[PDB]
Amino acid sequence: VNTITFDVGNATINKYATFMESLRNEAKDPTLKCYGIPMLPDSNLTPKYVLVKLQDASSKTITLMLRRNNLYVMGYSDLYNGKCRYHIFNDISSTESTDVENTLCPNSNSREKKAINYNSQYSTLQNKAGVSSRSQVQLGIQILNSDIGKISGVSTFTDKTEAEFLLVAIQMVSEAARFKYIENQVKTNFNRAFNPNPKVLSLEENWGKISLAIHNAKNGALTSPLELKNADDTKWIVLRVDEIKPDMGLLNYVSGTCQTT
């Protein structure tokens, strides 16, 4: 499995763009695409995982482990007192957990467990972070930088600190890779903190449905319209692929042929 590094501490818009390109190119199936939009592979294609190393301004790092087929974060590692400290979500199988141990921390004599004792659903992360919605958790480059430093190499930290980091990282890494719209929210706000708008949230919550609709669309027309939210919280009834393609970075895996095109 490959490691993609993003230097948060020294980030620029172009470095972030390159990071997004690199992550999409690593994770996508080598061939699958619909309407020109690359698709993630099935759950069998190897490597099954991608590592994303995030570096803060003090050169400390956290490495996220992502499932390639859906870009979900499985866990993360940090260097702690010389040890590879692995933090695994509580919602993956025993066989995947073995893979997370060995992929984050291949040397079995130099590693240490520090579990994430909760699941990776946004509702859970929000609860641990003390928010009723992740619209209340600002995103941003400086925030990500700061949050890395609250964890990496740190003996103890609260669940709220951890869940804030996870909310920010999951969105700025995996959601941004899935959605050019989210990448572009980060870029438009690159020098400052921002709150995820209704369209960010709607896209995040509907990636599966959107991916299916694009895969199934015939001559650019969705078989069944898909109702999302615009950034001003008005309904967005999507009728055609060209209305939503600009916001897409990656499609969720959907079996069978589509217009590639």
Q: Are residues 165 and 184 both part of a single domain?
A: no
Query: In Å, how far are 39, 64, 82, 162, 202 from 153, measured between CA atoms?
Result: 36, 15, 9, 13, 35
Short-list 86, 63, 68, CA closest to 4: 63
Residue that terminates a domain, selected from 177, 210, 227: 177
Q: Cβ–Cβ contacts within 10 Å for residue 131, how many?
A: 16
> Is the domain of 134 the same as that of 66?
yes
Instruction: Say yes or no: 146 and 189 in one domain.
Output: no
In 3D space, the residue among 127, 149, 145 whose CA is nearest the CA of residue 136 turns out to be 127
Q: How far apart are CA 120 and CA 73, in angstroms?
A: 8
Residues 6+ apart with CB under 8 A from 116: 75, 87, 88, 89, 90, 162, 166
Distance CA(108)–CA(101), nearest Å, equals: 8
Active site residues: 175
Separation of alpha carbons 242 and 231, rounded Å: 18
The reply to whether 14 and 24 lie within a common domain is yes
* Whether residues 35 and 111 fall in one domain: yes
Round to whole Å and give the CA distance between 20 and 32: 18
* Burial zone of 218 (CB within 10 Å; 0-12 exposed, 13-18 middle, 19+ buried): exposed
State the CATH number of the domain containing residue 224. Answer: 4.10.470.10
Using the 3D structure, point to which of 177, 204, 219 is the last residue of a domain: 177
Cα 45 from Cα 105, distance rounded (Å): 22
Angstrom distance (rounded) from CA 86 to CA 70: 21
CA-to-CA dists, residue 69 to 26, 27, 72, 112, angstroms: 11, 7, 8, 27
Residue 244: how many other CB atoms lie within 10 Å: 24
Contact 178, 249 (CB under 8 A): yes
By what technique were these coordinates determined? Answer: X-ray
Asked if 236 and 229 count as a contact pair (C-beta separation under 8 A), the reply is yes
Please state the φ and ψ torsions of residue 77, each to the nearest 5 degrees: -125, 160
Report d(CA 63, CA 183) in Å as an integer: 20
Query: Are 56 and 167 in a shared domain?
Result: yes
Q: Are 124 and 218 part of one and the same domain?
A: no
The domain that holds 59 is classified in CATH as 3.40.420.10
Residues 26 and 15 in one domain: yes
In terms of domains, do 6 and 30 share one? yes
82/78 Cα distance (integer angstroms): 10
What is the C-alpha separation between 236 and 225, in angstroms, rounded?
10
DSSP of the chain: --EEEEESTT--HHHHHHHHHHHHHHHS-SS-EETTEEBPPPTTSSS-EEEEEEE-TTS-EEEEEEETTT--EEEEEEEETTEEEEEE-TTS-HHHHHHHHHHH---TTSEEE----S---HHHHHHHHT-SSGGGS-B-HHHHHHHHHHHTT-S---HHHHHHHHHHHHIIIIIHHH-HHHHHHHHHTTTS-BPPPHHHHHHHHHHHHHHHHHHH-BTTEEEEEEEEE-TTS-EEEEEEHHHHGGG-S-BPP--S-----
Which of 157, 177, 197 is the C-terminal boundary of a domain?
177
Strands 49-55 and 61-67 come out as antiparallel
Do 18 and 122 sit in the same domain of this protein?
A: yes
What range defines the domain where residue 163 resides?
A: 1-177
Asked whether residue 150 falls in the same domain as residue 29, the answer is: yes
Same-domain pairing of 11 and 39: yes
**How many structural domains comprise the chain?**
2
